[PDB]
Symmetry: D2
Subunit: 123 residues, 4 copies
């Protein structure tokens, strides 16, 4: 499987989903990589993006809610790891949802392949 899954307590690359809030029709879901025990952010090694998917209970198909790209990793004309701008693999998605469902998160490490995390959304 292209999408690797691991315990997030013991494994660095699993994208972790946290349902923070559910206000006025609007859910806010936090997704992060390297939550308890941190992942590197270097020119050579970094998390590039996270994509969040939501499949509502009555739906035949899942929907992509969004995608967060982490594009800065210290590269500059003065050489790798010199720009001082490093983007964290952490994202917050605000979306309107009416019913409950399964949230799926995908993440990509530039040297460690593709990863997946899951959680349930109760409305």
């Amino acid at each position: 499987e292209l999408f690797q899954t691991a315990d997030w307590k013991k494994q660095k690359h699993v994208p972790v989903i946290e349902v923070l809030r559910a206000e006025g029709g609007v859910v806010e879901v936090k997704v992060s990589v390297g939550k308890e025990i941190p992942h590197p952010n270097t020119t050579e090694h970094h998390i590039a993006w996270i994509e969040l998917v939501f499949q509502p209970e009555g739906s035949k198909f899942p929907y992509v809610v969004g995608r967060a790209e982490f594009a800065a990793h210290g590269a500059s004309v003065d050489g790798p790891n010199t720009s001082g701008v490093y983007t964290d693999p952490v994202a917050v998605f605000a979306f309107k949802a009416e019913k409950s469902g399964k949230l799926t998160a995908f993440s990509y490490c530039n040297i460690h392949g593709l990863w997946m995390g899951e959680a349930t959304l109760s409305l």
Copy 2:
């Protein structure tokens, strides 16, 4: 000019930059379109993405911090605006910075073209 810019309290499409935190190298910036006056989110008309660019003081070139795509706008097999899943154009960027610098936000409406906002990052 392709990137339209106006007052954000006065115009729905201007992406608004809010520095939530900026202490000790640990920065968090909130970006949103339609802060004062909400922008619609239907399948036919919606904000599609936000891109954050950051240029540190000593740098000749700007760096892209990140990009947030907002992909769900209610489309489903039951017709447009039927899914109950709508992504709000608000994004949160967490990144490390070593110097202060200038922030630039870009946004896209599928029917109203491209937009821009600016702010300063103080550490």
Copy 3:
């Protein structure tokens, strides 16, 4: 499983991979959805993107080659399907490969979910 890998009856969603070039490692890969039987492209219903993944023979992890986003679906200030601009779901990924390996392409329809198709690239 989220990624559907088998196409339906009269409806073509499976992303098709065609190798246009493979000369000494200088590769060109075309990916298309609904190549022969066109897939609809309207403001309400359209393919949003294709992502191509490549995993070399000696590699433990796969690498993402690229992603092509198709952003125009006819929406304009005059209403859905009025702008006359529609981006076709076809992409060309140009990359170097030094080894043979596995190609995996992913695509997303806004109302019909996520899809996966595969091919092997031989040098």
Copy 4:
């Protein structure tokens, strides 16, 4: 202005736009970085994406045609520039247009900032 522009014969960062087809409403646009003078593709220094924008002449607003991400730059578990997979900054955008218009392409280098090129689309 963030988007730098130069002659593309004398500067390898300028995205070069080439109209491959424009027959009866069927447009094909090739955009590429480093047509004349190749740009390096290393883990440390590389072109990340190209975005195509088009404003049909009778339109108040420009439309984003598409966006191409070039994600592989040779990085692997054995260190930078070790994968043998390097994605070339070249993209092909296939789209429907009903009128002629103006094309604008934007591109990004991770250390050299943002770039812009223009061309006219006659149908």
